[model samples]
Target: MDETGKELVLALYDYQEKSPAEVTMKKGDILTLLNSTNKDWWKVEVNDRQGFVPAAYVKKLD
Candidate 1:
């Protein structure tokens, strides 16, 4: 109910001031993988902050 796909990712490094659609995250932070309309960023949601982050910064959970 909170998020889709049960897809989780670990943020490799801190990200901020990237874009309007981009949210901040810290290294090794676990967030939900909503989608990636573009190849460079993937939508991640934490708390109420929903936005994109660098695709390379996260890895798919096993």
Candidate 2:
């Protein structure tokens, strides 16, 4: 099946990875968004690795 939708998020700050399961993001870095569950947390992937990013920390766009 095809993905229903996709979102690209712009990294606003150089947030270091908080966990081994997470990833590092630099300011202006664009990341593929996987899920936007309203826990004020965002789900994303750098590959097959699913991880989280802060909702308020990133700039969202359609």
Candidate 3:
């Protein structure tokens, strides 16, 4: 969660490396959605490392 305690569940899988913004993960890894202001790329944090990922590569949990 962020400062306001609002958070979304994100997961990564079979992601292609594009840049330093990209992160690799297994099919079941969970991430915290950091920012979603940009539709093409969303910032997220996993195991304390934060980076941008393609929006299409992640699934948001309800």
Candidate 4:
């Protein structure tokens, strides 16, 4: 399973804001596929914080 215990989440715009303490995923950077509940949404982690992203930028692999 993924870090978020999910199959996949759509990536948003290939660019997203990073948390101040975030070091894993950088700001405005494309990242691995994430977790999403529906279209135009994805789940990802910044540092240790996890959230949803839009499908506009994510490239689905599964």
Best by TM-score: 1
Candidate that would win on lDDT = 1
Sliding window of 10 residues with minimal summed lDDT for model 4: 20-29
Root-mean-square deviation per candidate: 2.2, 3.4, 3.2, 5.6
lDDT of 4 by residue, 12-35 (tens): 344544553222333355444444
CA error at residue 61 for candidate 1, angstroms: 1.5
What residue runs in model 2 are displaced by over 4 Å at the alpha carbon? 1-5, 47-49
Candidate 4 residue-wise lDDT at 2: 32
| Model 4 pairs in collision | 8-35, 9-34, 9-35, 9-36, 11-58, 13-57, 35-43, 42-53
TM-score between candidate 4 and the true structure: 0.40
Task: Report lDDT (Cα) of residue 4, candidate 2.
Answer: 23
Ten-residue region with minimum lDDT total, candidate 1: 1-10
Candidate 3, superposed: residue stretches over 4 Å from native: 1-6
| lDDT tens per residue, model 3, 1-62 | 23412365556566655787776655676767788788888787767667777777777774
How well does candidate 1 match the true structure in TM-score terms? 0.79
Clash pairs (backbone) in predicted model 1: none
Ranking by TM-score: 1, 2, 3, 4
**What is the descending lDDT order?**
1, 2, 3, 4
**How much lDDT does each candidate structure score?**
0.79, 0.71, 0.67, 0.47
After best superposition, candidate 1 residue 13: deviation in angstroms? Answer: 0.7
